[PDB]
Design an enzyme around this catalytic site. Structure first.
Site, PDB file in Angstrom:
ATOM      1  N   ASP A 356      -1.721   3.055  -3.107  1.00  0.00           N
ATOM      2  CA  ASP A 356      -0.907   3.383  -2.070  1.00  0.00           C
ATOM      3  C   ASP A 356      -0.863   4.831  -1.514  1.00  0.00           C
ATOM      4  OD1 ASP A 356       2.149   4.077  -0.813  1.00  0.00           O
ATOM      5  OD2 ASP A 356       1.342   2.323  -0.048  1.00  0.00           O
ATOM      6  N   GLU A 396      -5.877   2.903  -0.872  1.00  0.00           N
ATOM      7  CA  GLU A 396      -5.594   2.535   0.413  1.00  0.00           C
ATOM      8  C   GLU A 396      -5.925   3.539   1.454  1.00  0.00           C
ATOM      9  OE1 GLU A 396      -1.156   2.804   1.443  1.00  0.00           O
ATOM     10  OE2 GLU A 396      -1.550   1.840   3.319  1.00  0.00           O
TER      11      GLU A 396
END
Ligand SMILES: [Ca+2]
Ligand SMILES: [Ca+2]
Ligand SMILES: [Ca+2]
Length: 637
Positions: A356, A396
């Site tokens: 993330d 990500e």
């Protein structure tokens, strides 16, 4: 077709598929033999020009004629780049008398390119199960409530002064007055995911599960981590996780599965004990005291209210990674009992991490995309691969993730927003993934796809997370205005393209949804049956991909880019199979003469359209097939 001072681009070809590269993922001691296709008797000479990073200089390898293809339509020239541990980049100079052409990751060119060269990264490897699998992403609270007893109830608890609100399954995700969208719960948990494994691994056929955060956190999404070492009670406990992992890995309930978890390492939630902004623990967090044993884990501009965070959100205090060997790098990935290693080692043994906000990870509150960021992800790889060489690392990133992959020292791949999600959206729905008006023609689509593939090493390309939509963008079905056929088209492309097909829960049946949080609706299980058109196609397409390795790691060649009829055709092929995919992006049906001779499909040989089930015969290097609007065919042999 002859020595006429002219190199014919249409007969040229090269990529790192098995027919053209004998060592796509070489070690230091393996030389790389490359093959370049051209029309038979079209050129006079060809040369491999490669840059060697060990030598910061270009090197020349004249190529020699090797053979013809079965159909006698093409020639194949070869050359070998020597073995060494150094990263190299190459392109081809192709000559026919006075005509010279160049060719690299971006295809043919009249002038010599200075970018998009092919990659040779010795000892760099991405897990093959990732390249060959099909992924299914699940936002835990909205998939299936397998255990009603651990459900967050309305008022169960408060977070920053706001009570939680429970919703009936199928209800709207929006928080009623007095409640927050981040604190709306439907009851989805790990037991539920476990109980629905048959649907995922058999009804659909997906062998890889990727879950949004499941660790202790007060919110719905849980990107505001409170405890990385404990599964959030709403989802179960750590044992519930172990059981799930074992059932995923089990082959008694379907194909062997893999589990990828969401790692939120750029920041923690403000309620994490290291921070403890609301004093939920007897210990003193960084927000509570400058003498806190974790004070240094964060960066304060003005203690304690002004600190570095994720894009300004105070609920997400940013972690300070300091220099190598720091305590933070230790708790996140270096320590055997770190977050990264804990779940990768038994009794968990998960198979990967989705990173993330990976681009922001840094020291002293800086915003990454710098030397420190890349150093951190380099050590991260060493830590992870050191525990499990087959553990996946998918960062990500919404743009060109070349910086975190092209060195072979960081991620295995990335969220393919730029090379898949966006181009697919604009071509099929005429909207970008934000549902904003943005349309592209077939020629632009193909150009976009090629250009984005060229941003990455072949193994990285084959491991990219290709999803139609996810938790941060509008649902494909909404962008398509509810036209299920558009989903049909999207699926066929997705299941036959380069990279890990990734299904965001619900997309397989045409679930709709706007911007977050409406893109995280509860899953309707009455639509989760092959009785649903989209679902049946998905199962069929997944079965097809698993049947043909050429679809996962084979070469990719553009065959047709027709902007008048909106027809797009490309081929996927290796030493065993040749597959011509034909997509109709128009709103009417068209009869197409597919030039399968480009893939060297012998005349008289047959092929089958796996989508319909009908068979065809190759006549004059062609295959005539009628395709419905917003639909497609997969002609394989
Ligand atoms: Ca020629
Ligand atoms: Ca539950
Ligand atoms: Ca405290």
């Amino acid at each position: 077709a002859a020595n006429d001072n002219n190199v014919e681009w249409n007969g040229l070809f090269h990529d790192q598929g098995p027919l053209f590269d004998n060592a796509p993922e070489p070690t230091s001691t393996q030389s790389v033999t490359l093959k370049l296709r051209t029309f038979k008797g079209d050129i006079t000479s060809a040369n491999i020009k490669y840059w060697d990073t060990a030598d910061n200089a270009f090197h020349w390898v004249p190529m020699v004629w090797d053979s013809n293809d079965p159909t006698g339509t093409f020639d194949y020239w070869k050359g070998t780049i020597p073995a060494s541990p150094s990263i190299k980049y190459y392109r081809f100079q192709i000559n026919d008398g006075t005509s010279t052409a160049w060719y690299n990751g971006n295809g043919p060119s009249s002038t010599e390119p200075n970018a998009d060269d092919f990659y040779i990264i010795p000892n760099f490897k991405t897990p093959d199960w990732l390249k060959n699998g099909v992924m299914y992403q699940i936002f835990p609270d909205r998939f299936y409530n397998g255990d009603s007893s651990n459900d967050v109830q309305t008022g169960s608890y408060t977070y920053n002064g706001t009570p939680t609100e429970k919703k009936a399954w199928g209800s709207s995700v929006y928080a009623d007055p007095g409640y927050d969208n981040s604190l709306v719960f439907f009851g989805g948990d790990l037991a539920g995911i476990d109980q629905k494994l048959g649907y995922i691994k058999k009804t659909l056929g997906a062998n890889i599960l990727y879950l949004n955060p499941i660790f202790k956190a007060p919110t719905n999404h849980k990107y505001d981590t409170q405890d990385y070492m404990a599964v959030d009670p709403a989802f179960g406990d750590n044992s519930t996780l172990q059981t799930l992992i074992n059932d995923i890995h089990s082959t008694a309930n379907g194909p062997k599965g893999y589990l990828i978890l969401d790692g939120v390492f750029n920041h923690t939630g403000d309620s994490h004990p290291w921070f403890d902004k609301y004093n939920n623990f007897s210990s003193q967090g960084a927000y509570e005291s400058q003498s806190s044993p974790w004070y240094n884990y964060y960066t304060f501009y003005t203690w304690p209210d002004s600190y570095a965070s994720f894009l300004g959100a105070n609920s997400l205090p940013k972690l300070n990674y300091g220099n190598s060997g720091s305590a933070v790098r230790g708790v996140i990935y270096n320590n055997s009992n770190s977050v990264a290693k804990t779940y990768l080692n038994p009794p968990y043994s998960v198979d990967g991490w989705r990173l993330d906000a990976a681009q922001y990870v840094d020291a002293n509150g800086n915003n990454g995309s710098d030397v420190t960021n890349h150093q951190i992800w380099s050590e991260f790889r060493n830590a992870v691969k050191g525990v499990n060489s087959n553990a996946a690392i998918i960062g990500e990133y919404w743009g060109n993730a070349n910086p975190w992959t092209a060195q072979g020292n960081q991620w295995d791949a990335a969220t393919n927003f730029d090379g898949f999600t966006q181009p697919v959206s604009e071509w099929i729905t005429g909207k970008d993934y934000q549902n904003n008006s943005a349309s592209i023609s077939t020629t632009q689509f193909d150009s976009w796809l090629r250009g984005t593939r060229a941003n990455y090493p072949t193994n990285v390309q084959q491991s990219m997370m290709n999803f139609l939509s996810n938790h941060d963008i509008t649902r494909f079905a909404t962008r398509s205005g509810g036209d299920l056929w558009k989903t049909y088209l999207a699926l066929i492309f997705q299941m036959t393209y380069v990279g890990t097909p990734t299904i965001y829960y619900g997309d397989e049946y045409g679930m709709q949804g706007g911007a977050d949080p409406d893109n995280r609706r509860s899953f309707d299980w009455s639509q989760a049956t092959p009785s649903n058109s989209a679902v049946a196609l998905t199962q069929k397409l997944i079965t097809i991909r698993n049947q043909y390795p050429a679809l996962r790691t084979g070469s990719f060649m553009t065959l047709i880019t027709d902007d008048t009829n909106k027809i797009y055709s490309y081929g996927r092929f290796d030493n065993v199979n040749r597959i011509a995919v034909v997509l109709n992006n128009d709103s009417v049906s068209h009869t197409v003469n597919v030039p399968v001779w480009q893939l060297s499909m012998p005349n008289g040989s047959t092929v089958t359209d796996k989508i319909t089930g009908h068979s065809y015969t190759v006549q004059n290097g062609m295959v005539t097939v009628a395709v419905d609007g917003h639909y497609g065919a997969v002609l394989a042999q």
